[model samples]
Target: MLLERDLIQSVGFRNVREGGEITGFQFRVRMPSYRGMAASLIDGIGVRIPGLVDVGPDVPLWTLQGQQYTLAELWDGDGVRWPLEDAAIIFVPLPGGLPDGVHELSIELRLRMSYIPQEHQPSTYRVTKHVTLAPEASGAPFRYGVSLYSYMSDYGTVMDLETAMASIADLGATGIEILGEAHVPNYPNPSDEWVEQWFALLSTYGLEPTNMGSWIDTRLHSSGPNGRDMTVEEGAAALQRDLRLAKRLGFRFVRPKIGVVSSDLIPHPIWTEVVEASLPLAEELDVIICPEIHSPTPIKHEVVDDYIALIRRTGTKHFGLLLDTGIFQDRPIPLKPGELPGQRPAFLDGIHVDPNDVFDVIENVVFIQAKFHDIDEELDDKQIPWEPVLKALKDAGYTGYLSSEYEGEREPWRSIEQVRRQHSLIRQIADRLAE
Candidate 1:
């Protein structure tokens, strides 16, 4: 076993004190230094880190000066550590297959720190953090990439494209994907101002636009299980609109989120034609349209496999798949939902993703959307299956961004925490398998 794993099972995970001026725990992680990280930052047998979150779904990554921390960005755009108002400590996990060169890691945890609040706090408290773990790969280091798709609500009040991007870039990641509401304020067409911001932020953060999650119908207009209400022509027009936005925003991939009309999981027939028609334009615009195999979307779902098979049959290079991480969710993990004023749904079922099926279509993956919603720690297979994901990617030799597409019951604030926790777990699992 790697160093950190051995330590975790022995001392750190066994006994740790919490409370007083400080209210957190600390542990050490053993990372294989592909280079000589141990000679540099790491001294003892392992690197120490601040707390393992008690919260369920919303796990945070980096903790800052105060007892506060920020969630890791979904992709690699801007957010490294969002700097909490309170005092806390966290280490960022640089899980790029262990960088090549000299490196090591060491850290300390303490009591007595202040948790501060932002200037504009008039409502529920929100915090985000980033954590970095320095690991040494046992063998040669190879390159791996991850990205953050900084969009979801299309026009939610909690939108902050600039800060979002900045967080992504801080994590030593380069690819940044845009979420629908985050970038395309208006479904069909966003103003040039939004477009300008896209270019400006990408350049400023030194980030590349990895992909865009645009919907044919953001409203879920169609009552059918398939989700789209319009005819094939309308769907085609929607694709064209998204492709145009992709061109405007300088994204290499487009992911169309097909909503869940009912639990039955039926996709619209017109979607096939629409996707087929979008290929030429997608290629022309230098973007590939990825029909996401997302949750509420199973391979067994009617019309889904057909759509994928069609993409394969036509041999349309521009038409491909963008896998969403949420589809891998095996079971639901309850988390404290935040105080968002607008959250109304009768029933939001958790996703049950299959890794085997996912790898079957891995070749079609144009982009990968890493979605997370309440990871069940009790899961026999580890709720979200990050191991299979990293394994399959390594096995298949894929080099694309695993964009963050987090969706949990917790409000955006708390959800960010869950993302952090899961992020750290992912790195640990990834490193363990590295050897």
Candidate 2:
């Protein structure tokens, strides 16, 4: 244990949870095309939250690719501060109203603790089922479709419909998972009349609407007096609006990215309240909600690991984990010749995963994001294994869309080829499973 701490400290992250959260930051973007805050009427909107224990440990920091900026300290009456964690719920006054339309911004927590010797360290999951999925023995309603995350990065970005439909058609994926409002450049729900045209695109591309990435907003100023992310009322309102959209479009899966929702962190008891309220609303909307367990800071994260507890408390089938394939990967792909006809996902400095834990919770997997940035044909055996992942899915009787969530850093266009290759590979794996 001491050795592990030393290893972790060398990477600059301490064992302190409060430090990370108090200092941790997240990135948010607003579409300029969408109705936006008036520069003068609106102040800057973002969060500087703390760890699970809710104790302020350090000031928050943000970074772009290379540049870093320290946020101005919160002053008296500037915002609300959580007493336990000392996370200031301050909203900097937006000086000039943000111009209307879509705007993108990136923020990196200056330094999340890292481990040295354990570099690209293998990962292990301690799965606690949140939404008890139907028994694995039962047939699933949906077959997995590939998520385009590998082509997409962890950082959020909106993809155009032209691009979305084109990509789905190219990959021959049955279903597509995509960002709805945030990525919907023409915010406020694309003209209702045009939704069918969008649906037509799906049909033309041979794609099904397995998932619609809508979010439930709740945050400082978003819900409460000062603008909260999106209040309960607002979230419900948004969900209904999206529900109407989903209904119009015949979307079977409506994955609401819950209220400015985040993972790994024990949700605010209030968040549970929010989800509880949304349950009936979701039932009325007639769509299934799937909470994503995409890692780094996930429900699996130690800090907010009580995800199962929260789910049990709610006892609502409104949501379950949308597990990503990356969490099971242990290392970079060791590419072997003949596996592909083109380039592959570039491996990051060091990323790891545990395969054992993956199958453990396959029962709760409502949807899947086939996440992988790099591929090692050699690693296909024990390292960065996907076939086994597919086997596990089959074993779990998971017939859900394995949405393509390719997160490799490269020309996203080229990723289309990788997707094609992966689709073929996955087909064979699935075939072997039947045998």
Candidate 3:
């Protein structure tokens, strides 16, 4: 685990020497993106030690995957992609290392988003940390994890399963959440070898399998004259299949993304019947079946009340609510490029559910998708107000994985950095409230 969650890692802040003589100092820093990128995508990195040393672009050498490269070399195509899970070692050339005290360190990373329009091609991010030059330093309340959905574009394109697991582990997150349909290779039925490798990666990364995201495509068939919605039996069968797979993968929760039938995001009327039929299997497998309380459906509505009612009626621990933090988004996110006014989905405007509303169903809340669009460098989230929400959860003694679900710009590598920023922000809040 990293001693600090800043972009500049604290564990590797030390002086580099050759032949027992201190020549320069080196520190480890992580790329501020969700996906690894070709070396060329990095425009430059700037390092500043306040009034002591300030270097930009010409800051000397960068080490990635045990190979060292200069700025010019990186720009000229080094044939190496910086992995999102690994931090790059930056060496600053200096004759004598600074005094052994705390010094403010600032880093600026300029990266190119090749997939976005040229107007937004390159982005710059800056972070500062007051770190000790010679010393290093170093939380289990509410397990942290990243949903593979956070890497929607990066998964198959730039990142793989192991990379995703490594990224989550790098954050010191104890859990890893995945959408069974998207990440399980062959969906409900993956190859035995892949399943074996999945456990290996989990063990190597030290991450417990968290919630398995499953979907009930209620309207798999068209609804007019010749078609019909998904039957309750079909939905139950789907849930059972997911439950068995999740159990096989060592997961304790299965979140069924049930199809909604209304504009207000109401689950199809057959949801209860499906869940009821699947409850026996869920209980047998010891996996909880959670239906997300997503946006446009506030926590205090009939939607939530009905779910609570069902839980009480069945008295089965298998059925619970998976609360998505998007419900508490207090601000509207920016519209996508070329999207006209009112073209954005109504949900993007934010449902603005009160953070305190979690108290209403805290007991039934089994897991949380820490959904957000953007988090700035200052550690302030643009859409979700996480402090009160985390505080409320802490007060309510709700212990579950706050699995990150970054639903921001689909541009090449944004989610990686955004998710990191979210972990930093939420962890800070949770730590403070715990104290």
Using TM-score, give the best candidate's number: 3
The prediction achieving the highest lDDT against the true structure is 3
Once fitted onto the true fold, the runs of candidate 3 whose alpha carbons sit more than 4 angstroms away are 1-140, 223-225
Q: Write the per-residue lDDT of candidate 3 for residues 167-191, one digit (tens) a residue.
A: 6776667788999989999777899
lDDT of 2 by residue, 1-435 (tens): 011111111111111123323333222122121232212212123222222222122333322223333343322123322222111122112222222111122211111113424554222211111111111121233354644444453123334455556545544456766666644446655775577577677777787777766666555354545653445566566666776666556665666555323333334334555555566766777776666664443324642334455556777665566676666665655455465524653432224555545555665567777766643232132334676667766766677777766655465244544454455456546665677
TM-score of each: 0.59, 0.53, 0.74
CA lDDT, every model vs. true structure: 0.50, 0.46, 0.81
- Candidate order by decreasing lDDT: 3, 1, 2
Q: Rank by TM-score, descending?
A: 3, 1, 2
lDDT (0-100) at residue 57 of candidate 3?
Answer: 62
lDDT of each residue in 1-435, candidate 1, tens digit only: 112112121112111123423233333332322222111121122232233323311242333323233332322223332221211233333222222111122332111112324453211212222323222222112222233443344114443666555445533446777665444667557777767777887799798877776776634464667764577777788788888877777888888765444555555546677777778888788888877776656645654577678876888788777777666666544434563333532123345555666556767767777776554332123346677767766676566666666565434443333333444455556566777
- RMSD (Cα, Å) for all candidates, in order, is 13.7, 23.6, 8.9
**Candidate 1 off by > 4 Å:** 1-159, 186-193, 218-229, 259-262, 300-304, 335-353, 374-382
Misplaced by over 4 Å in model 2 are: 1-144, 148-160, 182-185, 217-241, 258-264, 297-315, 332-360, 376-383
Error of 1 at 190 (Å): 4.0
